[PDB]
Amino acid sequence: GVEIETISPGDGRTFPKKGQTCVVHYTGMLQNGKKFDSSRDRNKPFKFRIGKQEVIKGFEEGAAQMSLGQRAKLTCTPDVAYGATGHPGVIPPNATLIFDVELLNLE
């Protein structure tokens, strides 16, 4: 269950593909909750690649549905990220995740 509420600006033609490494400013938000992660604070905007399932399942399909410069607004279902067990200390079990994701990549 991937839903996109697009903050517009980009080109809508440059899409990330397989065998590529993409760079994302991201910000984590809990539904009716607080900020638990911010790529803006550390200023190292999280270089990662596509297809190796390094990131969670909900975030991976959200990056492919974007283009260069675009700014999405994810809403991942609990069953695709952490809802069974829950991340220790940080994410409660069966929780819905909110993301502010902007794609500023290369390749």
CATH of the domain at 35: 3.10.50.40
Cβ neighbours for 33, distance < 8 A, ≥ 6 positions apart? none
- Token look-up 């809802």 returns 83
Provide the resolution (angstroms).
4.5
Segments in 24-100 forming alpha helices (H):
39-42, 57-64, 78-81
Say if 99 falls within a structural domain: yes
Q: What are phi and psi of 88, to 5 degrees?
A: -65, 120
Say if 57 falls within a structural domain: yes
Question: Active-site residue numbers?
Answer: 26, 36-37, 56, 82, 99
- Token look-up 């517009």 returns 8
Instruction: Say how many domains are in the chain.
Output: 1
The coordinates were experimentally obtained by cryo-EM
Cβ neighbours for 49, distance < 8 A, ≥ 6 positions apart? 20, 21, 22
Alpha-carbon gap, residue 76 to 16, rounded angstroms: 20
- Taking a C-beta distance cutoff of 8 angstroms, is the pair 46, 107 a contact? no
**Could you count the other beta carbons within 10 Å of the beta carbon of residue 54?**
10
Alpha-carbon gap, residue 96 to 61, rounded angstroms: 16
- Token look-up 């909750």 returns 33
Structure tokens that stand for 84 in this block? 């069974």
Say if 4 falls within a structural domain: no
Say if 12 falls within a structural domain: no
Domain residues for the domain of 42 are 21-103
Nearest to 103 by CA among 28, 9, 31: 9
- CA dihedral 82→84→87→89, nearest 10 degrees, is 140
Question: Strand, coil or helix: what is 79?
Answer: helix
